[PDB]
Amino acid sequence: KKLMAQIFFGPTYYQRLRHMVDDKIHARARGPMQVLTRQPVEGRSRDGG
Amino acid sequence: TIRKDGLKLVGSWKKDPELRVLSTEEILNIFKHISVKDFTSLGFNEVFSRPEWMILTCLPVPPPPVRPSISFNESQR
């Protein structure tokens, strides 16, 4: 069916930015602990909390 | 009149000036002679903190858990 409103429509230049979700998703139940304080390590690269 | 010059207390006795460094030995001795009533009026406690315990004569050494050797060189401590 026809849309009751007419749509603004046309080509436009878009950039893909460096921030993707697959580089940011991170979850941790249990894993490595810090040697001094016996607390979880820091950062998703180290499976941190 | 007592001032501090770095980590040491220098006393200038008004001339009865005599400037000299107060040895921690004599400060400890004069702290140990303070009566219980005197230093309990100064805020100290007879059981948990006497003034003469502010002078260090025996250092407690923490166990290795306090100061661990986190060797990351995979061979060198």
From Swiss-Prot, chain A:
Location in the cell: Nucleus
Known partners and oligomeric status: Component of the RNA polymerase II (Pol II) complex consisting of 12 subunits.
Miscellaneous field: The binding of ribonucleoside triphosphate to the RNA polymerase II transcribing complex probably involves a two-step mechanism. The initial binding seems to occur at the entry (E) site and involves a magnesium ion coordinated by three conserved aspartate residues of the two largest RNA Pol II subunits. Present with 18700 molecules/cell in log phase SD medium.
Family that this chain belongs to: Belongs to the RNA polymerase beta chain family.
Part of the full-length chain shown: 1079 to 1127 of 1224
Organism this protein belongs to: Saccharomyces cerevisiae (strain ATCC 204508 / S288c) (Baker's yeast)
Superkingdom in the source lineage: Eukaryota
Function according to Swiss-Prot or TrEMBL: DNA-dependent RNA polymerase catalyzes the transcription of DNA into RNA using the four ribonucleoside triphosphates as substrates. Second largest component of RNA polymerases II which synthesizes mRNA precursors and many functional non-coding RNAs. Proposed to contribute to the polymerase catalytic activity and forms the polymerase active center together with the largest subunit. Pol II is the central component of the basal RNA polymerase II transcription machinery.
Name of the protein described by the UniProt record: DNA-directed RNA polymerase II subunit RPB2
Gene expressing this chain: RPB2
Swiss-Prot record, chain B:
Superkingdom in the source lineage: Eukaryota
Region (Lid loop): 68-77
Subcellular location: Nucleus
PTM annotation: The tandem 7 residues repeats in the C-terminal domain (CTD) can be highly phosphorylated. The phosphorylation activates Pol II. Phosphorylation occurs mainly at residues 'Ser-2' and 'Ser-5' of the heptapeptide repeat. The phosphorylated form of Pol II appears to carry, on average, one phosphate per repeat. The phosphorylation state is believed to result from the balanced action of site-specific CTD kinases and phosphatases, and a 'CTD code' that specifies the position of Pol II within the transcription cycle has been proposed.
Coiled-coil regions listed: none
Additional facts recorded: Mutagenesis experiments demonstrate that the minimum viable CTD contains eight consensus Y-S-P-T-S-P-[A-S-N-G] heptapeptide repeats. Identical and simultaneous substitutions in a number of consecutive repeats are lethal: 'Ser-2' -> 'Ala-2' (14 repeats), 'Ser-5' -> 'Ala-5' (15 repeats), '2-Ser-Pro-Thr-Ser-5'-> '2-Ala-Pro-Thr-Ala-5' (10 repeats), 'Ser-2'-> 'Glu-2' (15 repeats), 'Ser-5' -> 'Glu-5' (12 repeats), '2-Ser-Pro-3' -> '2-Pro-Ser-3' (15 repeats) and 'Tyr-1' -> 'Phe-1' (12 repeats).
Family classification: Belongs to the RNA polymerase beta' chain family.
Free-text domain note: The C-terminal domain (CTD) serves as a platform for assembly of factors that regulate transcription initiation, elongation, termination and mRNA processing.
Quaternary data: Component of the RNA polymerase II (Pol II) complex consisting of 12 subunits. Interacts with DEF1; the interaction is direct and serves to bridge RPB1 to the Elongin complex in a DNA-damaged dependent manner. Interacts with the Elongin subunit ELA1. Interacts with the Elongin subunit ELC1. Interacts with ASK10. Interacts with ESS1. Interacts with RTT103. Interacts with SHE2.
Function field: DNA-dependent RNA polymerase catalyzes the transcription of DNA into RNA using the four ribonucleoside triphosphates as substrates. Largest and catalytic component of RNA polymerase II which synthesizes mRNA precursors and many functional non-coding RNAs. Forms the polymerase active center together with the second largest subunit. Pol II is the central component of the basal RNA polymerase II transcription machinery. During a transcription cycle, Pol II, general transcription factors and the Mediator complex assemble as the preinitiation complex (PIC) at the promoter.
Record-given protein name: DNA-directed RNA polymerase II subunit RPB1
Annotated gene: RPO21
Residues of the full protein shown: 173 to 257 of 1733
